[PDB]
Design a protein around this nucleic acid. Sequence first.
RNA 1: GUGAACAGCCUCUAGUUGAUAGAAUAAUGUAGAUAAGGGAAGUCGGCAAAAUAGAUCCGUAACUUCGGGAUAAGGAUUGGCUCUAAGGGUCGGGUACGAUCAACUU
RNA 2: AGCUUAUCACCCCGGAAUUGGUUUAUCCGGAGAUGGGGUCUUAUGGCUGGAAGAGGCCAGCACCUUUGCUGGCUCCGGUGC
RNA 3: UUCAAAUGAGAACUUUGAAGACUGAAGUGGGGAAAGGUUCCACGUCAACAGCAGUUGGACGUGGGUUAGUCGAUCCUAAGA
Lengths: 50, 67, 154, 77, 131, 104
Amino acid sequence: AAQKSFRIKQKMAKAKKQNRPLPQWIRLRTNNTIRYNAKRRNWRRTKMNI
Amino acid sequence: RQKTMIAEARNRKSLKNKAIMPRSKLTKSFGKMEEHMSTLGHDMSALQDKQNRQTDRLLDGVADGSM
Amino acid sequence: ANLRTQKRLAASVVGVGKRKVWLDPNETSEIAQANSRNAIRKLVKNGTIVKKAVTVHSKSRTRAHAQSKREGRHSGYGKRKGTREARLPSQVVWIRRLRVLRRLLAKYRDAGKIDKHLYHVLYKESKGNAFKHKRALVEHIIQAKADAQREKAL
Amino acid sequence: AREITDIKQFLELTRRADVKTATVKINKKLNKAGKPFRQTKFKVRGSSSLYTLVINDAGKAKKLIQSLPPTLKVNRL
Amino acid sequence: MGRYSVKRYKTKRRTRDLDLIYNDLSTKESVQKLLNQPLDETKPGLGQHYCIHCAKYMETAIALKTHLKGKVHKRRVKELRGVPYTQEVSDAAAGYNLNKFLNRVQEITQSVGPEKESNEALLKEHLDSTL
Amino acid sequence: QKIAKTFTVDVSSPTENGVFDPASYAKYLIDHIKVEGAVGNLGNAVTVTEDGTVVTVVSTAKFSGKYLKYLTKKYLKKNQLRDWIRFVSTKTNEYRLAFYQVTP
RNA sequence: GUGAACAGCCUCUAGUUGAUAGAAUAAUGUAGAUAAGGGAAGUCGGCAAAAUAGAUCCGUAACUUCGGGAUAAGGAUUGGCUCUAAGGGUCGGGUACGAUCAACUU
RNA sequence: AGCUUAUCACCCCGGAAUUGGUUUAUCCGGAGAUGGGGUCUUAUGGCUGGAAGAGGCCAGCACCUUUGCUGGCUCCGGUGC
RNA sequence: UUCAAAUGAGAACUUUGAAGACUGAAGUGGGGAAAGGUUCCACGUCAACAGCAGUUGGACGUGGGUUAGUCGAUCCUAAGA
């Protein structure tokens, strides 16, 4: 709200660093069942509820 | 000729919407202006003489381009 | 190319809104290389981006309309659309009227034209009516100082 | 900013062992009709405030400029 | 066709017209007939206070003083100045009945003209005295 | 009281180019300068004298530098020299003529 | 700017030119209008629409708790352009005016 | 930051009916009016310092160019329901 | 809403210039409180989304960016916990 508390801010920083696609080299491992970042977030689609 | 210059001035100005562009900030092309001064009757011999570490997190894992 | 940046960016440098700055179409490669404010000052002053000075809003008809208002035209009953109290309130007339009759009597009393006994009667008679305007009161002083003189003769 | 009228008072302030830099500024103004004449201002930088000295005469400036202490760094314009 | 012309200029809402008003001032009888009408209940001024030029009844005698001092009534005075435009002005323009038309312009210049101008000059003296 | 001012115009730069002549210019001023209303109402209030390169106007009357600029833009429009010749102030009450940026 | 006005209408600084488009103008629509003569005969019913409107002056009833009713009702007028009259300050008078100066109201 | 500036309020001398002063708005006076001479609050204003070196408007050279450099002027008023 | 030019495999829709209009200072303007959390800016770039289109975007990919003795919180108390 541009007057934010630090506890509110620290959870933005964790959500910012999770806002990424999956790395390209994890496609290449052995027995990779993981395909896409299925916990991907967006500010438009889903509010993160503080 | 007085009706033509008035008819010529209608398509030029359009003052009510924006502006007329300043002649000082713009520049001429030698071009048309020697054609215009020929119609006034001045000779153009004299004025011709003056003309004469980014670290992409996707692809820093695999180095070779084939992979 | 895409030039929404330099259109916006030259507006910040010259200090005029985005509707005013002019980017010539002949220099479409020279402008697109500039991606900093420091290049834009150089691109402005050598004559690629200019100012496009202000759209005219003349006031010639307004002055020539108001000049006839001084002479007393456009003032009939057809032009008016408000009451007299909306146009000129009766308190504002009374305040202009009744401060004149206070400071006229103030300057006669100090100059010695009138004594303090006749001041205090013309003071309260001016608080009501019977002195409509400035000329009508000075005529009353002439009559009253004549009536004072004619009684003094007898 | 303080304005100082006394020439004597200003001479002590350059000697106060607190002032490191000074500056002289030359201005060109007018008396009522008069003549165009130069005007000088002497500014000394204390720790707290900026002391100034307005000399309207051109002749007294040449007298006072030499009277500055030599270790005191002087700026011109 | 429009909105405003149909409001004022229907056949129901028609005034007398400029012909008959000139004939009323042409003689001394009809001047004194129209001024001194008998009182009638349907009429607006109860058959009193009637202007001859503008064929229109006024309510109060004060409503004549404000009516005679105005650009509406000064208009109808200027309208009734010349030859009153009968049918004979229209036919004389085509080249038809000149001597019928030329006798009428001769009479109105000589005979009826200054007699009408005397009758209007006595109305302005009569309405001055009663008001 | 009515202390006169000297107003100088340099016309040397269009004179050599030949599109302009200074002699017809100096005649154009002496009748059109309006002293209190009507043209020609001046009785020796102004003088218009020319070098051939320098036109000099000395006026005791009410006469201003913008108004002197106003008359020269009247004259260049009649001769169709506008779009090409401008009227600049180099120093105060001293004026000269110039072409624009003709460059291709 | 018009005007009683931060109304409505038009413009300057600033901002936008986004809302799927192209061609034709059948019926029926939704939105907005005009109509000869008669004027509510229409209809559950004057629903709706038309009419009146700003402003100065004249003028105003029954009734009334005397304050209201009241903008009751009703009636004259309004543009333009040249004019005249009235309405002010600041200065000069031995302890009547003259000068200069600037406003929009009727 | 410096110097100066005000309605209100306050003190001194003085003793007032033939009542006086005074606001658009009628209140004040022997519990001391009007008047004459003074003190104070500094909302606020004026000038000087800050501060023209800044900013603004133009003109002139430079020039692939880091892009600057050099000049001028930056003044004085008026009015209000 | 219109015309040319550039960009492009491609243009009713992107960029620039020339036109035409509109919001008309109780605005389609300039900032902020709740609320959202990187949307802000640059570089690359169009399979999906933007109910037409797309070279463009609040999309996608990678990075860059919020500096305080004086502005706020922190201190005090209100109804109240």
